[PDB]
From a paper:
Synaptic complexes of α-amino-3-hydroxy-5-methyl-4-isoxazolepropionic acid (AMPA) receptors (AMPARs) with auxiliary subunits mediate most excitatory neurotransmission and can be targeted to treat neuropsychiatric and neurological disorders, including epilepsy. Here we present cryogenic-electron microscopy structures of rat GluA2 AMPAR complexes with inhibitory mouse γ5 and potentiating human cornichon-2 (CNIH2) auxiliary subunits. The core of each complex is a Y-shaped tetrameric AMPAR with a three-layer domain organization. Auxiliary subunits are membrane proteins that associate with and regulate AMPAR trafficking, cellular localization, gating kinetics and pharmacology.
Recently, we noticed that HEK293S GnTI− cells transduced with GluA2–γ5 and grown in the absence of antagonists displayed more intense fluorescence of the C-terminally concatenated green fluorescent protein (GFP). We purified protein from these cells, supplemented it with 0.1 mM ZK and subjected to cryo-EM. Data analysis revealed two distinct populations of particles. The second population produced a three-dimensional (3D) reconstruction with densities for four auxiliary subunits around the GluA2 channel. The map quality was sufficient to unambiguously identify and build models of four GluA2, two γ5 and two endogenous human CNIH2 subunits. Despite each GluA2 subunit in GluA2–γ5–CNIH2 being covalently linked to γ5, density was observed for only two γ5 subunits, suggesting that similar to GluA2–γ5, the other two γ5s were disordered. The transmembrane helices TM1 and TM2 of CNIH2 form a binding interface with M1 of GluA2 subunit B or D and M4 of GluA2 subunit A or C. Positions of CNIH2 in GluA2–γ5–CNIH2 complex are similar to their positions in the competitive antagonist-bound GluA1/2–γ8–CNIH2 complex. Comparison of the closed-state ZK-bound structures in the presence and absence of CNIH2 revealed a strong cylindrical density in the selectivity filter of the GluA2–γ5–CNIH2 pore, which was not present in GluA2–γ5. We subjected the protein that was used in cryo-EM experiments to mass spectrometry (MS) analysis and identified the presence of polyamine SPD. In agreement with this finding, the density in the selectivity filter of the GluA2–γ5–CNIH2 pore showed a near-perfect fit of the SPD molecule, independent of data processed in C1 or C2 symmetry.
Residue numbers in the entry:
A (entry chain D): 206 to 254
B (entry chain B): 10 to 498
C (entry chain A): 59 to 205
Write the structure that this text describes.
Amino acid sequence: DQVITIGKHVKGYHYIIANLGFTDGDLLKIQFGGAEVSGFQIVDYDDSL
Amino acid sequence: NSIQIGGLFPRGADQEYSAFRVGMVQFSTSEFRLTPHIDNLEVANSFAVTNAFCSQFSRGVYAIFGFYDKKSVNTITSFCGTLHVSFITPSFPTDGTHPFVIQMRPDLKGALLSLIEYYQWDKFAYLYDSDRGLSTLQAVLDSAAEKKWQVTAINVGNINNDKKDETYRSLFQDLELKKERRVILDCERDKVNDIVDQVITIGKHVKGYHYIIANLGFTDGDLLKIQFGGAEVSGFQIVDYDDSLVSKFIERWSTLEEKEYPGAHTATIKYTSALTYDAVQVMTEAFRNLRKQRIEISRRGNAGDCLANPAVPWGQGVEIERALKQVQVEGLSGNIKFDQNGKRINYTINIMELKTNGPRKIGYWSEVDKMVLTEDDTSGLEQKTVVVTTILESPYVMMKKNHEMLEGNERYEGYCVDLAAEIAKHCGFKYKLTIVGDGKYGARDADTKIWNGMVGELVYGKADIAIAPLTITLVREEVIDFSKPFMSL
Amino acid sequence: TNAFCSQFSRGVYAIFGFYDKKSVNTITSFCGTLHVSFITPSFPTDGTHPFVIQMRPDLKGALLSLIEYYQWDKFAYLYDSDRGLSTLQAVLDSAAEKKWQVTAINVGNINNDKKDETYRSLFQDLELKKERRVILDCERDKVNDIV
Ligand SMILES: O=c1[nH]c2cc(C(F)(F)F)c(N3CCOCC3)cc2n(CP(=O)(O)O)c1=O
């Protein structure tokens, strides 16, 4: 949220959410900005269990 | 002495109805009375406007205070035009000369054209709103020919409430492919809050993208979203809170209830609501000035058949209308002074910006004098123009042949001048040439120890650099720190 | 409004009639509420007003297809604001995409003493920018006055 209000999610600013469960947050805020945000998950939903 | 007035408030107007219900009593002297018959309705539907115009014609009011929209401005001004029933409103500043209809909203259409010339634009995009009319679109296109603009007017007022997210993004992605880093947003309040959110999510509020919220009441929105981005967002207000009547009013306003006046506790008033307070001031100052000249405006059991064939007046006509169009009150908008038509003369639309601190004011637009820049001129913030002290000795800096034609830092030319222009690019600064008085490159005096010439001005205080032929010697290296040499003579 | 209720005081079943842009909102609201079908050879309304039967079909698309056949980007779209701005709103939205440079002048509200001054101020203020591709957009009475 404080990246967005000061406008640091435009094209260029790469991020790495180093937290094990990357999609557990509110990613539909910087998804459409233009900043490549990588991440880490363990519970990959495209699987059997 | 208890004059019956109508008043057609919309179905979704709460704060607007508040400042009517507020301004009714805290303005009224108990002599007169302003008995309403307020009818709420969906004003985009000329059917219900027609019923409620004749319902308040059946009861025989002397003025109606309604809000029209695009799809009903041709209904209100037509019925009021023929049946002579006076009408006062803060809605659209009507295209043309409709009689008996008092516009209290100021005419924005001139203030937008003045502002752009101050920023000197040519390359807008003019996202506008279809439902709020197009009279401003035919003032920045009709006047785009003369001043060579390249308006890229995109209608955004037809956007569905499910395809909102997709279309506004595809809107600016289209404007990005044309590289339009200037938008002159034109909508009403709730579409400005929906655009500013969709500007942020796609990250178009960084440094560069100027905006102009062309809406009369710039601070009525949610500006603490793009305040800290970096995008200069100008604007327009009429209720300037740094004044007498507003500050008195806002103290009363901020103390009000949550359920007696809905949406009143907030310390900012909507301009639609704000003019409504200034309306009630006009809506009796005429009528009490009317009682100063003894005009009995009274009537009878007026037939509730507006659609009478033939259609006669209500009697007396212009007698009300003369009173309304002479009222010079002072309200919380400025000098409310009308004309023979119903448009406001001599108001004070004041141009704002949006700095990091908050919504700063930078002066005003007002019919007589176009754009007054009454701003803090103490915001200089300069990069002080250093006194480059220089001797005059060719093939270095020499005086050009047109030596009495131009002035300042273009007069001199030579080796030092092209050196100064080249050193200024790297050491980034600004500079203004200065020839020393006596000559005398450098000399410490015999006993008084007063330096001479360019050393005398570099040492003491009246210089910042000495781009000139000074020989690096020992007795000038102590007091002045040289640069590594640019020429080995 | 007078005549519509005079027709409603006879209980008519189809109303033929014309409407300007100053009466479009009165009719399509009345015929939408009081469900009386209204047949009209006037400019079609923007939007989706029910119970009006419009028969001047649509110019809005044909004007956009004719320009593409001539391949323009240098118009001078002189419009008359007495028939709906709905066509101007089309060749400004479609002026974004196809890279056009419309210079839309209101040639509408102009009285008769300035008819030999405003137009002779008008075309010179197109010739000074060298516009050669005017898209005159008026009803017949105003077209012959420009021509
Ligand atoms: O720092 C110094 N730089 C100087 C630079 C020059 C020039 F060549 F013009 F650049 C001259 N000139 C030599 C020829 O006659 C005209 C003046 C004198 C300079 N002097 C006085 P100096 O003691 O005689 O050297 C300085 O002190």
